[PDB]
């Protein structure tokens, strides 16, 4: 109903392409290419064209996290670790824009090359899963230049969008943000989750939100529990849909 609500509603439907309803890649448990409403609603398919694969329920979750941070005066930026085509970060920048927020940044972190090749240093669950095998099949490698172009299409490429290109184990320890209000983790593997919890989570403000996109994946979940056990973190884990969870840092 308000201009703000209308904009953010359309922005979600647009970055997930409920508007034009692109086919999905046939991969994983998806056995047909046709668009299925319930799969895009829950972020369960692999869009051929859409700018995000997280789906409406996880987009609604990101909106709730950012809005709650803003309402409650939780200081800091938004970081997403694993962005693909950039749709969820585009949406994040859009939320700031809708509220005319000029003092927070959206940090966009990725290899911009898809999943890394497995080495002997990987966690054995990451090695067995070998996410790198799927890069082309779902068009995962998405260059920095492409992501930036995608932001421009929505008129949201500006100096409150900053990019952190590279492997998370390399980029996160010295990433130049001071404080985060929302940390959205979407790198799927034990390694990526643990890199980001280790190196970015300490900068998450009290009251801020930690979102684990891929908690359904056993390697991801293992890292979340190892990390929480190590640091004494007991904040409730709340489910979003069939894949994602989040907690709010107390």
Ligand X SMILES: Nc1ncnc2c1ncn2[C@@H]1O[C@H](CSCC[C@H](N)C(=O)O)[C@@H](O)[C@H]1O
Which residues have a Cβ under 8 Å from the Cβ of 90 and sit 6 or more positions away? 11, 15, 51, 52, 150, 151, 154, 156
154's tokens: 């929505």
Q: Is 116 in the site for ligand X (CB under 6 A)?
A: yes
Q: Which residue of 105, 111, 205, 243 would you call a contact of ligand X, by CB under 6 A?
A: 111
Nearest to 138 by CA among 47, 210, 206: 47
- Each residue 142-171 as x (binds a second copy by CB under 8 A) or -, in order, gives -----------xxx----------------
Beta bridge partners of 161: 106
Q: What is the smallest separation between the CB atom of 200 and ligand MVI, expressed in angstroms?
A: 17
Q: Is 84 part of any known ligand binding site?
A: yes
CA distances from 148 to 37, 89, 92 (A): 28, 11, 14
Helix H, strand E, coil C: the string for 31-78 is CCCCCCHHHHHHCCCCECCCCCCCHHHHHHHHHHHHHHHHHHCCCCEE
Residue 10 binds which of Mg ion, a second copy, ligand X, none (CB < 5-8 A, kind-dependent): a second copy
Asked if 125 and 45 touch (Cβ cutoff 8 Å), the reply is: no
To 5 degrees, how large is the angle CA 132–CA 80–CA 49? 60
Q: Rounded CA gap, 132 and 118, in Å?
A: 7
Which of these ranges, 1-9, 26-34, 221-229, 242-250, lies near a second copy under the rule CB under 8 A?
1-9
Q: What is the smallest separation between the CB atom of 211 and Mg ion, expressed in angstroms?
A: 10
Q: Which residue of 24, 56, 82, 241 would you call a contact of ligand X, by CB under 6 A?
A: 82
Q: What is the smallest separation between the CB atom of 46 and a second copy, expressed in angstroms?
A: 16
- Each residue 51-70 as x (binds a second copy by CB under 8 A) or -, in order, gives x-------------------
Q: What is the smallest separation between the CB atom of 150 and a second copy, expressed in angstroms?
A: 9
Q: Is 133 part of any known ligand binding site?
A: no
The residues binding a second copy (CB under 8 A) are 1-7, 9-11, 13-14, 17-22, 49, 51, 94, 97-98, 100, 153-155
Binding-site residues, in ranges, read 52-53, 80-84, 110-114, 168, 186-187, 213-214
């Amino acid at each position: 109903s308000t201009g703000v609500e209308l904009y953010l509603d359309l922005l979600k439907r647009t970055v997930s392409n409920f508007i034009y309803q692109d086919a999905t890649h046939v991969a994983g448990l998806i056995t047909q290419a046709a668009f299925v409403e319930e799969a895009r609603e829950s972020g369960e398919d692999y869009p051929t064209v859409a700018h995000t694969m997280i789906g409406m329920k996880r987009l609604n979750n990101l909106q709730h996290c950012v809005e709650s941070a803003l309402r409650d005066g939780v200081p800091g930026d938004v970081l997403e670790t694993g962005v693909w085509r950039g749709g969820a970060c585009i949406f994040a920048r859009g939320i700031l824009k809708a509220y005319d927020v000029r003092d927070r940044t959206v940090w966009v972190a990725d290899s911009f090359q898809g999943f890394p090749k497995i080495t002997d240093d990987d966690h054995p669950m990451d090695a067995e899963m070998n996410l790198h095998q799927y890069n082309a099949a779902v068009d995962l490698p998405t260059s920095l230049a492409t992501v930036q172009r995608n932001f421009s299409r929505y008129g949201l490429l500006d100096d409150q969008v900053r990019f952190l290109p590279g492997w998370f184990k390399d980029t996160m320890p010295t990433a130049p943000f001071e404080r985060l209000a929302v940390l959205r983790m979407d790198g799927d593997s034990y390694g990526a989750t643990m890199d980001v919890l280790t190196h970015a989570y300490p900068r998450l403000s009290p009251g801020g939100f930690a979102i684990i996109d891929d908690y359904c994946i056993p390697a991801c979940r293992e890292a979340v529990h190892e990390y929480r056990d190590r640091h004494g973190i007991s904040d409730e884990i709340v489910e979003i849909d069939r894949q994602g969870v989040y907690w709010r840092r107390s």
